[PDB]
A = this chain, B = another copy of it.
Amino acid sequence: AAEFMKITILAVGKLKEKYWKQAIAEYEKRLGPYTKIDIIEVPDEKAPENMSDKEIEQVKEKEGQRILAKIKPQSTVITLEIQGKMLSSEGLAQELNQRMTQGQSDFVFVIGGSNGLHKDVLQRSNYALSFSKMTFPHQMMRVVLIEQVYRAFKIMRGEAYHK
């Protein structure tokens, strides 16, 4: 218990709108006293409309190589996958708290680019996490995720906010 948790949001591409940036800064600020959190962005390939199957795969492969070069073998990797496992807000806090009680302290949340994640990234994942059956765009998704991490930490500390 001599260590605070470490949360990394590892995402593909930069945010393009000032309002998403402002939302993320506010949740980073709110999460500051509870965990070290940092956001790491890696280059996104250009994503035209209707590319071939081949081209989609190559985009995911290039982005995947960048994502994997930023991940250490000992980190607990949680990949955001539409078709991953669904958890309630109390369920996400339970899963992180359980892993923390088990000694895990370095969590890396991974967000794919517009075409999703390469099989090698999905294979390295220690937990596939779905936020919904719906498809969220990657910029907004980053905000939704950090707000939910904020929520999970309030629940874990048993502090008011989740109504």
CB closest chain-B residue, reference A92? B134
Check: A114 CB closer than 8 A to any chain B CB.
yes
Task: Determine which of B22, B91, B144 lies in contact with A136 in the assembled complex, contact meaning CB atoms within 8 Å.
Answer: B144
Chain B residues near A34: list those with CB within 8 A.
Answer: none
Chain B residues near A17: list those with CB within 8 A.
Answer: 22-23, 26
Known: A87-B133, A131-B134. A160 touches B19 (CB 8 A): no
Asked if residues B132 and A86 are in contact (CB atoms below 8 Å), the reply is yes
Asked if residues B19 and A135 are in contact (CB atoms below 8 Å), the reply is no
Asked if residues A140 and B144 are in contact (CB atoms below 8 Å), the reply is yes
Check: A101 CB closer than 8 A to any chain B CB.
no
Check: A151 CB closer than 8 A to any chain B CB.
yes
Asked if residues A132 and B135 are in contact (CB atoms below 8 Å), the reply is no
Closest CB of chain B to A155's CB: distance in Å?
A: 10
Query: Chain A 7-25, CB within 8 Å of chain B: the 1/0 string?
Result: 0000000000111101100
Chain B residues near A54: list those with CB within 8 A.
Answer: none
What are the 6 A-B residue pairs with the smallest beta carbon separation, nearest first? A49-B160, A19-B19, A19-B22, A132-B132, A89-B135, A88-B133
